[PDB]
Write a protein that binds this ligand. Structure first.
Ligand SMILES: *[C@@H]1O[C@H](CO)[C@@H](O)[C@H](O)[C@H]1NC(C)=O
Ligand SMILES: *[C@@H]1O[C@@H](C)[C@@H](O)[C@@H](O)[C@@H]1O
Length: 291
């Protein structure tokens, strides 16, 4: 989730002394190493206290005086303090220069401040006292982590869980045809019924039971429906001159069949039924008999 990094830049111990006053002076060279303690911001800085955000120490870097400003900074001259919590922005940093081979302090430093995730280094100096030392600090985010606390996670996906890439703010930007916060809801065919149509995959309008068409907006009439319509699934509402549950009964056998012959007037009597009114010199149920 994140790392606080500390790099040693330089040490200047001209006299090759210690914090007490003793020598590690042409007797011997100081075996200079660094101890680091990182905790919560303190308005009134304590010497002790637990190192809540991390503790660490370097192996022997150099002698009495060394300059690493033009050098790279490797596993030996730097300390990495990782963190899984949200970066609180504010911190209290304790950096100490120590001599190896009983161990005793050379110079002690403390710094209370505020820092945001950034690859850019912040140089800090210990100018007071006999021994002078420089160092640089920074807080960087781990891969897929965003925000001021290096706590916002975003990894691009094109699978079961989502189809998106990540913003500069670690916000999900949906792939074409996807929507929602997790970018896992497919965008249906343009015109697809909001009531009876649904997705699974982009531009694929799947019909609700009893609905049909390219847009799932047309009801399926009751099976066996002839001369009837529907507004709802399984309906079979008859058109003019049609009757019955399935709209199969002809209520206008007259306008259909035209049974009366030689210009006679036809009248209805219900399901497939008629009546003929015959002209001059005509007889029969269908006015077929002349005279
Ligand atoms: C975009 O990122 C900002 C900052 O993290 C957040 O407050 C906002 O809710 C995000 N927008 C969306 C749509 O997720
Ligand atoms: C209906 O009745 C028959 C007898 C004819 O006169 C037709 O012209 C009429 O429309």
């Amino acid at each position: 989730s994140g790392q606080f990094e500390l790099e040693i830049l330089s040490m200047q111990n001209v006299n090759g002394e210690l914090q007490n006053g003793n020598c590690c002076c042409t007797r011997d060279e100081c075996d200079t190493y660094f101890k680091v303690c990182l905790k919560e911001y303190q308005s009134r800085v304590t010497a002790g206290g637990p190192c809540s955000f991390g503790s660490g120490s370097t192996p022997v870097i150099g002698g009495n005086t060394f300059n690493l400003k033009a050098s790279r900074g490797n596993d030996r001259n730097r300390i990495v303090l990782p963190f899984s919590f949200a970066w609180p922005r504010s911190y209290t940093l304790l950096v100490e220069a120590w001599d190896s081979s009983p161990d005793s302090i050379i110079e002690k430093a403390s710094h209370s401040g505020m820092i945001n995730p950034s690859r850019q280094w912040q140089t800090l100096k210990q100018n007071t006292g006999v021994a002078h030392f420089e160092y640089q600090i920074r807080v960087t985010c781990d891969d897929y982590y965003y925000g001021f606390g290096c706590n916002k996670f975003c990894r691009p996906r094109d699978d079961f869980f989502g189809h998106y890439a990540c913003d500069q703010n670690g916000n999900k930007t949906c792939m074409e045809g996807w929507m929602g916060p997790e970018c896992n809801r497919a965008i249906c065919r343009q015109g697809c019924s909001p009531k009876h149509g649904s997705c699974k995959l982009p531009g694929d309008c799947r019909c609700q039971y009893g609905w049909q068409g390219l847009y799932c907006d047309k009801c399926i009439p009751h099976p066996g429906c002839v001369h009837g319509i529907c507004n709802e699934p399984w309906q079979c509402l008859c058109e003019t001159n049609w009757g019955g549950q399935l709209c199969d009964k002809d209520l206008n056998y007259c306008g259909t069949h035209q049974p009366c012959l030689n210009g006679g007037t036809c009248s209805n009597t219900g399901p497939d039924k008629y009546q003929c009114s015959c002209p001059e010199g005509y007889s029969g149920p269908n006015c077929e008999i002349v005279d």
